[PDB]
Amino acid sequence: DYGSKVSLFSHLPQYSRQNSLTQFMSIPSSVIHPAMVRLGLQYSQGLVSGSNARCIALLRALQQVIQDYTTPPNEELSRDLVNKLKPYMSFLTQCRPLSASMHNAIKFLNKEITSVGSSKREEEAKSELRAAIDRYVQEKIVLAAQAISRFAYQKISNGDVILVYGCSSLVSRILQEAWTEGRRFRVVVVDSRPWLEGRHTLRSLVHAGVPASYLLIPAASYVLPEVSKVLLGAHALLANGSVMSRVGTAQLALVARAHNVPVLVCCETYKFCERVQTDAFVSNELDDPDDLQCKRGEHVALANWQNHASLRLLNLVYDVTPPELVDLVITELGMIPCSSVPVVLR
Amino acid sequence: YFKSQMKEDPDMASAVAAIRTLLEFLKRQGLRANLTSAIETLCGVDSSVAVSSGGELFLRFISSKCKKIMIERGELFLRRISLSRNKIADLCHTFIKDGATILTHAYSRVVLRVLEAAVAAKKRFSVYVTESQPDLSGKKMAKALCHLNVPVTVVLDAAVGYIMEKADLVIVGAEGVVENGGIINKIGTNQMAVCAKAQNKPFYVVAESFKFVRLFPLNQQDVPDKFKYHPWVDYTAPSLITLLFTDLGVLTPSAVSDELIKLYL
């Protein structure tokens, strides 16, 4: 842990970016696989921060690890591999908390490994595991976005003013595919500090030819009156109908409801978790607190904030939105309500 | 008294006609009894809250060898009531936007004057009017508004919730303003105010000062039965009203009670 945490957020880990976990490790990593080591280093340094990008990188690293995995004698691999992959996941979590996508993916991989019988050969098992990972990715990530792109194309109209927030690999694709089909609309990109990841969507839209706008989230109440729809992306859909997404989503949906604007949500079926949550206090993630430091004017005001023992710096990442503010959810199965997540989980 | 023709010229409201009749009959203490006699007689013809409000206001104003002061005060009050509408319109026409959509329920001279004063300022807007099923006054309002070069549209009384999302603001006239701040208007006003409140749509009301009635209805049944008579009037709570545009200025629903208390009616 680094720095002093908040009283209400003292049950969560607060790591740092400068403090690397590879200091107390061998350059040729013995206990940990080099692939997983570099993956955790990238996660800690922020090289891979996308919800789906993180899962894809994790699965590719796991494929690489399996490619060079030798089953010892005196034991089967169907269990040795599961027992060996656990410390890797623990190290990855120590580097950066895992996401719901990564959790579901490792669960599916463990289930598939357990489904392998000792009756089969090692090479056949490894090849089947690799092919299974490949086709699972292609289905739940690649093919799971083409159906959502043609389902949301119906709800997009000419002259619409769609409002997006943050960065999402699915929202940008939906908009870029709807623009090329014949729709002529304009997008409003909302961003928040300190990540400022909305600029990614802004650039991806400008390069596509869609008229786009950019403004910070505090001014969301000023532009919403002219907004017709609010298309948002999330990281996970809880079993209680709620939605887990970036911290600046719940208040955005609240202001949209206050302005009488229909809110939408687009998520893949593989992000349908089984747990539940009521607020952003029981399970969240506190990133490095020094990200709030900003060069405003002539000097920084939080340059030595740790000298003040009473001052705390909260850097929440995720948040939980109630089902009372979500109208429609878009998936590969079709348009379903916000209170139908358990039905899809069935 | 004489027949209902002091309203031979249509423009003029019923309350102003009743006030003129009362003032002229005053030129014919013990006045009180005679006047109460008169207000009551007057009310048989018109079951309306504005007439009773004006009568009560005149009775309070009366509060008898010194009749010069009373006649002068009545003349000045009548002139002020006549100038009421121009002030109301000039003060309310600023809350309308270019290209905005307006929603009205029934026919009213005050809202019509407001709309004409707004369109006289080089403003363009669309207005939706409810047909007013009880008596087809919404069609009359739309006909009188189509002449002013305004794209008016008539909608059914049951379709007030279907076109609520398209409307940007709601403006209607009130026959009587209750003490708490509510209004007594056509039967199809409470449902419209409720539908507008559920969508954060502003709900403005325009009314004169001679319509401040000293009542306090708790529900749709506490209102006097003589004013309702298929009822012809309903009550709307002040929590559903945004502002009130009266000859005294732009006030909140919680300001009419202050005026009635200062008046000691």
Side-chain angles (χ1 to χ4, degrees), chain A, chain B residues 1-7 9-23 25-44 47-58 60-61 63-67 70 74 76-78 80-86 88-108 110-121 123 125-148 151-265:
Chain A
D1 288 64
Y2 160 74
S4 58
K5 306 187 288 182
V6 193
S7 55
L8 295 107
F9 283 103
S10 295
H11 68 286
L12 299 170
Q14 176 178 128
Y15 302 139
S16 178
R17 298 284 286 278
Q18 306 303 135
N19 171 85
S20 36
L21 202 68
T22 68
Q23 303 168 6
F24 329 104
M25 289 183 172
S26 66
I27 271 53
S29 301
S30 39
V31 48
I32 312 302
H33 201 278
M36 307 303 255
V37 162
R38 60 155 36 86
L39 180 66
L41 191 62
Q42 289 179 172
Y43 285 161
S44 71
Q45 293 185 3
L47 273 293
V48 177
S49 57
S51 154
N52 292 114
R54 284 179 69 191
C55 165
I56 291 168
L58 169 58
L59 269 40
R60 215 67 60 185
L62 287 158
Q63 274 188 326
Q64 250 292 314
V65 172
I66 292 167
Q67 180 55 35
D68 48 58
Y69 152 79
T70 67
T71 171
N74 80 79
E75 64 198 298
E76 308 170 8
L77 84 170
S78 172
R79 306 182 299 94
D80 190 72
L81 188 55
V82 180
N83 280 87
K84 185 197 73 167
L85 287 177
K86 277 195 280 290
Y88 298 155
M89 302 302 170
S90 82
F91 160 76
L92 290 174
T93 308
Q94 263 286 313
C95 281
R96 190 157 185 272
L98 311 191
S99 56
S101 51
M102 303 170 72
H103 281 304
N104 296 282
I106 62 178
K107 180 250 195 68
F108 155 80
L109 184 60
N110 295 127
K111 172 170 166 54
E112 196 70 8
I113 292 161
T114 303
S115 308
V116 192
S118 72
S119 155
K120 203 168 63 177
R121 304 174 72 267
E122 151 168 62
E123 284 70 27
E124 301 300 87
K126 295 198 291 182
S127 174
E128 282 202 356
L129 289 174
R130 285 173 53 82
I133 292 170
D134 277 323
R135 65 181 140 93
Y136 165 84
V137 171
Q138 192 72 9
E139 288 280 11
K140 270 70 189 306
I141 302 175
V142 175
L143 296 181
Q146 300 182 4
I148 309 182
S149 74
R150 58 173 170 270
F151 274 134
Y153 170 73
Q154 304 162 12
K155 243 63 177 170
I156 291 170
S157 59
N158 303 27
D160 259 315
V161 183
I162 307 179
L163 183 133
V164 308
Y165 171 76
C167 176
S168 178
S169 150
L170 183 57
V171 174
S172 299
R173 169 157 187 170
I174 287 169
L175 300 172
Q176 290 173 0
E177 289 191 27
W179 175 267
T180 55
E181 285 290 344
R183 306 304 196 190
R184 292 285 168 281
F185 52 88
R186 64 193 196 84
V187 191
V188 187
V189 180
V190 192
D191 210 340
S192 57
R193 290 187 65 264
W195 309 276
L196 301 171
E197 61 187 13
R199 298 176 183 175
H200 310 159
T201 52
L202 184 65
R203 206 168 291 101
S204 184
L205 290 175
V206 172
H207 291 171
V210 192
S213 307
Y214 186 87
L215 80 175
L216 301 166
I217 184 160
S221 59
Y222 160 81
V223 80
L224 262 165
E226 91 198 17
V227 166
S228 73
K229 285 192 170 70
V230 172
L231 184 63
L232 305 167
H235 294 200
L237 292 190
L238 309 174
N240 76 279
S242 163
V243 180
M244 178 68 98
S245 180
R246 187 57 51 114
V247 75
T249 299
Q251 82 185 34
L252 203 74
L254 179 72
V255 186
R257 254 287 192 283
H259 283 271
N260 193 260
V261 181
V263 193
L264 316 175
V265 169
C266 60
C267 303
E268 295 86 291
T269 305
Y270 93 97
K271 291 178 174 181
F272 282 44
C273 72
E274 202 73 79
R275 61 157 189 167
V276 292
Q277 205 173 131
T278 47
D279 49 62
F281 280 81
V282 306
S283 156
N284 213 332
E285 174 172 340
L286 285 85
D287 289 24
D288 190 57
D290 298 357
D291 291 358
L292 306 177
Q293 301 188 152
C294 58
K295 181 58 154 53
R296 277 298 316 172
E298 53 270 35
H299 64 261
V300 189
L302 305 179
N304 301 327
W305 66 275
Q306 268 145 324
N307 291 342
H308 312 276
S310 312
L311 171 57
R312 257 62 169 178
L313 258 64
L314 183 62
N315 199 274
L316 296 182
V317 176
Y318 308 102
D319 72 339
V320 187
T321 88
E324 310 146 27
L325 308 174
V326 182
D327 308 70
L328 169 63
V329 174
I330 322 185
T331 55
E332 56 247 75
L333 300 94
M335 283 176 177
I336 65 179
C338 173
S339 306
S340 190
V341 169
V343 181
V344 173
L345 286 166
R346 187 195 315 156
Chain B
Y1 207 1
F2 75 129
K3 309 313 302 178
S4 41
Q5 282 294 277
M6 164 113 166
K7 283 179 331 197
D9 99 67
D11 239 346
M12 177 145 51
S14 304
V16 188
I19 291 288
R20 293 173 85 85
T21 295
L22 250 71
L23 189 66
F25 184 81
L26 189 139
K27 308 176 186 174
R28 245 66 175 179
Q29 221 248 12
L31 221 298
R32 277 242 190 51
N34 161 28
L35 262 184
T36 65
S37 14
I39 308 177
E40 149 52 47
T41 60
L42 253 196
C43 272
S47 73
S48 300
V49 196
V51 179
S52 308
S53 308
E56 255 63 46
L57 214 161
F58 197 93
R60 174 63 188 179
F61 145 76
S63 307
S64 66
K65 81 299 191 172
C66 278
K67 218 153 281 185
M70 219 183 296
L76 266 59
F77 167 75
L78 253 180
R80 178 66 200 278
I81 293 302
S82 55
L83 299 169
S84 181
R85 197 168 296 170
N86 288 126
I88 288 172
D90 175 63
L91 256 63
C92 174
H93 90 278
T94 314
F95 282 74
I96 298 172
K97 332 298 166 206
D98 203 335
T101 310
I102 314 183
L103 178 59
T104 320
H105 176 39
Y107 172 76
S108 165
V110 188
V111 65
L112 185 60
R113 194 74 63 85
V114 168
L115 292 180
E116 100 184 0
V119 85
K123 293 185 178 180
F125 48 82
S126 187
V127 184
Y128 280 102
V129 189
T130 296
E131 61 175 1
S132 295
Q133 180 50 221
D135 53 331
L136 290 312
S137 61
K139 298 187 178 182
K140 187 212 296 181
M141 178 61 174
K143 188 184 70 55
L145 196 66
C146 212
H147 162 259
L148 274 55
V152 73
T153 308
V154 173
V155 299
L156 288 159
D157 217 329
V160 73
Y162 175 89
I163 53 75
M164 190 63 62
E165 61 186 8
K166 290 192 288 182
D168 299 316
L169 65 152
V170 180
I171 180 170
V172 286
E175 304 182 7
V177 181
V178 294
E179 180 171 9
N180 44 277
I183 57 169
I184 300 170
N185 209 25
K186 203 72 172 300
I187 187 63
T189 310
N190 178 81
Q191 58 174 14
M192 193 175 66
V194 171
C195 287
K197 160 63 78 163
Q199 300 190 159
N200 297 85
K201 304 295 186 184
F203 192 93
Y204 302 108
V205 167
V206 293
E208 301 83 346
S209 268
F210 56 79
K211 292 181 176 179
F212 291 174
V213 74
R214 190 163 180 77
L215 297 177
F216 219 131
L218 280 169
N219 57 329
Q220 308 300 133
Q221 298 293 118
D222 200 81
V223 290
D225 196 75
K226 59 179 178 296
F227 297 148
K228 295 188 288 185
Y229 307 94
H230 282 359
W232 283 76
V233 111
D234 65 353
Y235 161 81
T236 295
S239 64
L240 318 179
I241 300 174
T242 308
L243 291 169
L244 288 153
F245 299 100
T246 70
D247 52 353
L248 307 174
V250 194
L251 313 168
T252 50
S254 61
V256 293
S257 188
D258 186 7
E259 305 299 337
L260 292 177
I261 288 168
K262 292 158 63 176
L263 189 66
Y264 284 139
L265 176 56

PDB file of all heavy atoms in Angstrom, chain A residues 315-328:
ATOM      1  N   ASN A 315      -9.465   8.375  -5.210  1.00  0.00           N
ATOM      2  CA  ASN A 315      -9.283   8.162  -6.643  1.00  0.00           C
ATOM      3  C   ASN A 315     -10.095   6.962  -7.112  1.00  0.00           C
ATOM      4  O   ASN A 315      -9.593   6.068  -7.799  1.00  0.00           O
ATOM      5  CB  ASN A 315      -7.806   7.977  -6.978  1.00  0.00           C
ATOM      6  CG  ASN A 315      -7.507   8.216  -8.443  1.00  0.00           C
ATOM      7  OD1 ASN A 315      -7.635   7.312  -9.271  1.00  0.00           O
ATOM      8  ND2 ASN A 315      -7.108   9.437  -8.774  1.00  0.00           N
ATOM      9  N   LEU A 316     -11.371   6.924  -6.733  1.00  0.00           N
ATOM     10  CA  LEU A 316     -12.238   5.824  -7.136  1.00  0.00           C
ATOM     11  C   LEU A 316     -12.225   5.658  -8.650  1.00  0.00           C
ATOM     12  O   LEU A 316     -11.969   6.605  -9.399  1.00  0.00           O
ATOM     13  CB  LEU A 316     -13.670   6.067  -6.653  1.00  0.00           C
ATOM     14  CG  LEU A 316     -13.882   6.107  -5.139  1.00  0.00           C
ATOM     15  CD1 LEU A 316     -15.354   6.306  -4.820  1.00  0.00           C
ATOM     16  CD2 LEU A 316     -13.353   4.844  -4.479  1.00  0.00           C
ATOM     17  N   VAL A 317     -12.504   4.435  -9.098  1.00  0.00           N
ATOM     18  CA  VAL A 317     -12.480   4.102 -10.517  1.00  0.00           C
ATOM     19  C   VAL A 317     -13.871   3.672 -10.963  1.00  0.00           C
ATOM     20  O   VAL A 317     -14.465   4.285 -11.857  1.00  0.00           O
ATOM     21  CB  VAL A 317     -11.447   2.999 -10.809  1.00  0.00           C
ATOM     22  CG1 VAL A 317     -11.503   2.589 -12.275  1.00  0.00           C
ATOM     23  CG2 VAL A 317     -10.050   3.465 -10.430  1.00  0.00           C
ATOM     24  N   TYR A 318     -14.397   2.619 -10.348  1.00  0.00           N
ATOM     25  CA  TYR A 318     -15.682   2.063 -10.739  1.00  0.00           C
ATOM     26  C   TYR A 318     -16.807   2.636  -9.881  1.00  0.00           C
ATOM     27  O   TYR A 318     -16.583   3.240  -8.830  1.00  0.00           O
ATOM     28  CB  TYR A 318     -15.659   0.539 -10.626  1.00  0.00           C
ATOM     29  CG  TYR A 318     -14.495  -0.116 -11.333  1.00  0.00           C
ATOM     30  CD1 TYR A 318     -13.394  -0.572 -10.624  1.00  0.00           C
ATOM     31  CD2 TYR A 318     -14.502  -0.285 -12.711  1.00  0.00           C
ATOM     32  CE1 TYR A 318     -12.330  -1.173 -11.265  1.00  0.00           C
ATOM     33  CE2 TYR A 318     -13.441  -0.885 -13.361  1.00  0.00           C
ATOM     34  CZ  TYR A 318     -12.358  -1.327 -12.634  1.00  0.00           C
ATOM     35  OH  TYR A 318     -11.300  -1.925 -13.277  1.00  0.00           O
ATOM     36  N   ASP A 319     -18.037   2.436 -10.351  1.00  0.00           N
ATOM     37  CA  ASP A 319     -19.223   2.825  -9.605  1.00  0.00           C
ATOM     38  C   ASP A 319     -20.373   1.917 -10.011  1.00  0.00           C
ATOM     39  O   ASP A 319     -20.324   1.243 -11.043  1.00  0.00           O
ATOM     40  CB  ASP A 319     -19.592   4.293  -9.841  1.00  0.00           C
ATOM     41  CG  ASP A 319     -20.161   4.537 -11.226  1.00  0.00           C
ATOM     42  OD1 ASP A 319     -19.910   3.713 -12.130  1.00  0.00           O
ATOM     43  OD2 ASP A 319     -20.861   5.554 -11.410  1.00  0.00           O
ATOM     44  N   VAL A 320     -21.420   1.920  -9.191  1.00  0.00           N
ATOM     45  CA  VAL A 320     -22.580   1.060  -9.382  1.00  0.00           C
ATOM     46  C   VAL A 320     -23.799   1.942  -9.612  1.00  0.00           C
ATOM     47  O   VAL A 320     -24.081   2.840  -8.810  1.00  0.00           O
ATOM     48  CB  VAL A 320     -22.799   0.128  -8.177  1.00  0.00           C
ATOM     49  CG1 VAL A 320     -23.896  -0.876  -8.474  1.00  0.00           C
ATOM     50  CG2 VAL A 320     -21.503  -0.586  -7.819  1.00  0.00           C
ATOM     51  N   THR A 321     -24.516   1.685 -10.709  1.00  0.00           N
ATOM     52  CA  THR A 321     -25.724   2.419 -11.042  1.00  0.00           C
ATOM     53  C   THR A 321     -26.956   1.580 -10.727  1.00  0.00           C
ATOM     54  O   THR A 321     -26.981   0.384 -11.037  1.00  0.00           O
ATOM     55  CB  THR A 321     -25.751   2.802 -12.527  1.00  0.00           C
ATOM     56  OG1 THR A 321     -26.346   1.742 -13.285  1.00  0.00           O
ATOM     57  CG2 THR A 321     -24.345   3.064 -13.044  1.00  0.00           C
ATOM     58  N   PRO A 322     -27.989   2.159 -10.120  1.00  0.00           N
ATOM     59  CA  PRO A 322     -29.189   1.382  -9.809  1.00  0.00           C
ATOM     60  C   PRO A 322     -29.986   1.088 -11.067  1.00  0.00           C
ATOM     61  O   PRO A 322     -29.876   1.816 -12.064  1.00  0.00           O
ATOM     62  CB  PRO A 322     -29.966   2.300  -8.855  1.00  0.00           C
ATOM     63  CG  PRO A 322     -29.539   3.669  -9.231  1.00  0.00           C
ATOM     64  CD  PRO A 322     -28.108   3.559  -9.674  1.00  0.00           C
ATOM     65  N   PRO A 323     -30.804   0.029 -11.066  1.00  0.00           N
ATOM     66  CA  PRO A 323     -31.641  -0.248 -12.243  1.00  0.00           C
ATOM     67  C   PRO A 323     -32.706   0.805 -12.497  1.00  0.00           C
ATOM     68  O   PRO A 323     -33.355   0.760 -13.551  1.00  0.00           O
ATOM     69  CB  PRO A 323     -32.279  -1.607 -11.917  1.00  0.00           C
ATOM     70  CG  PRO A 323     -31.475  -2.171 -10.795  1.00  0.00           C
ATOM     71  CD  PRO A 323     -30.957  -1.004 -10.028  1.00  0.00           C
ATOM     72  N   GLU A 324     -32.907   1.745 -11.575  1.00  0.00           N
ATOM     73  CA  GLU A 324     -33.929   2.774 -11.723  1.00  0.00           C
ATOM     74  C   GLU A 324     -33.548   3.850 -12.732  1.00  0.00           C
ATOM     75  O   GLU A 324     -34.376   4.721 -13.020  1.00  0.00           O
ATOM     76  CB  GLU A 324     -34.212   3.431 -10.368  1.00  0.00           C
ATOM     77  CG  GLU A 324     -34.491   2.456  -9.232  1.00  0.00           C
ATOM     78  CD  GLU A 324     -33.968   2.955  -7.897  1.00  0.00           C
ATOM     79  OE1 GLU A 324     -33.872   4.186  -7.715  1.00  0.00           O
ATOM     80  OE2 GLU A 324     -33.653   2.113  -7.030  1.00  0.00           O
ATOM     81  N   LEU A 325     -32.330   3.814 -13.272  1.00  0.00           N
ATOM     82  CA  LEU A 325     -31.858   4.828 -14.202  1.00  0.00           C
ATOM     83  C   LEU A 325     -31.456   4.262 -15.555  1.00  0.00           C
ATOM     84  O   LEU A 325     -30.970   5.017 -16.404  1.00  0.00           O
ATOM     85  CB  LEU A 325     -30.669   5.586 -13.596  1.00  0.00           C
ATOM     86  CG  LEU A 325     -30.898   6.152 -12.193  1.00  0.00           C
ATOM     87  CD1 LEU A 325     -29.616   6.754 -11.640  1.00  0.00           C
ATOM     88  CD2 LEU A 325     -32.012   7.184 -12.207  1.00  0.00           C
ATOM     89  N   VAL A 326     -31.641   2.964 -15.783  1.00  0.00           N
ATOM     90  CA  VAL A 326     -31.294   2.315 -17.042  1.00  0.00           C
ATOM     91  C   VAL A 326     -32.579   1.831 -17.696  1.00  0.00           C
ATOM     92  O   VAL A 326     -33.392   1.152 -17.055  1.00  0.00           O
ATOM     93  CB  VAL A 326     -30.313   1.151 -16.825  1.00  0.00           C
ATOM     94  CG1 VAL A 326     -29.926   0.525 -18.156  1.00  0.00           C
ATOM     95  CG2 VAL A 326     -29.079   1.631 -16.077  1.00  0.00           C
ATOM     96  N   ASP A 327     -32.760   2.176 -18.969  1.00  0.00           N
ATOM     97  CA  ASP A 327     -33.972   1.845 -19.710  1.00  0.00           C
ATOM     98  C   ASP A 327     -33.815   0.595 -20.565  1.00  0.00           C
ATOM     99  O   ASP A 327     -34.645  -0.315 -20.489  1.00  0.00           O
ATOM    100  CB  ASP A 327     -34.380   3.029 -20.594  1.00  0.00           C
ATOM    101  CG  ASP A 327     -34.481   4.327 -19.818  1.00  0.00           C
ATOM    102  OD1 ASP A 327     -33.430   4.847 -19.388  1.00  0.00           O
ATOM    103  OD2 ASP A 327     -35.610   4.829 -19.638  1.00  0.00           O
ATOM    104  N   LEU A 328     -32.766   0.531 -21.383  1.00  0.00           N
ATOM    105  CA  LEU A 328     -32.568  -0.567 -22.316  1.00  0.00           C
ATOM    106  C   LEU A 328     -31.132  -1.064 -22.238  1.00  0.00           C
ATOM    107  O   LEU A 328     -30.204  -0.298 -21.960  1.00  0.00           O
ATOM    108  CB  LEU A 328     -32.894  -0.134 -23.756  1.00  0.00           C
ATOM    109  CG  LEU A 328     -32.496  -1.087 -24.887  1.00  0.00           C
ATOM    110  CD1 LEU A 328     -33.240  -2.407 -24.783  1.00  0.00           C
ATOM    111  CD2 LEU A 328     -32.754  -0.437 -26.235  1.00  0.00           C
TER     112      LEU A 328
END
